[PDB]
Amino acid sequence: PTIAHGDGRRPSKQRTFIVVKNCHKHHISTEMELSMLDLEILHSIPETP
Amino acid sequence: STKSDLPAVAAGVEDQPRVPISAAVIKLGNHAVAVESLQKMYNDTQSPY
Numbered sequence: 001p002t003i004a005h006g007d008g009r010r011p012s013k014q015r016t017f018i019v020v021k022n023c024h025k026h027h028i029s030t031e032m033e034l035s036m037l038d039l040e041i042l043h044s045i046p047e048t049p
Numbered sequence: 050s051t052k053s054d055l056p057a058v059a060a061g062v063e064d065q066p067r068v069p070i071s072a073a074v075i076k077l078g079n080h081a082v083a084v085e086s087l088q089k090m091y092n093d094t095q096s097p098y
Contacts, residue, residue, distance in 0.1 A: 001093060001094055002094055003090075003091075003094045003096050
């Protein structure tokens with residue numbers, strides 16, 4: 001918005017401007033281990049307690 | 050007479066209905082006074098208060 005002025009100067013023009021922002025991107029990375037034996041026995045079928 | 054003329058002085062000022070208004074007030078001596086700041090509108094328009 002703008003105010004009206006009464007002085008000798010030319011009237012103040014109404015102002016609408018364009019504001020452009022940028023979107024940042026963040027990446028997150030976590031490392032985890034699993035030993036080969038931990039992954040192997042999943043395929044085997046256990047019967048004895 | 051002042052009482053006879055008071056309707057002539059207030060040319061429809063007492064007729065208009067009244068509405069509550071938001072403003073801070075203080076009691077100084079016996080006078081109640083309204084105190085406020087208008088800087089919001091002038092800050093919104095980038096004009097000097």
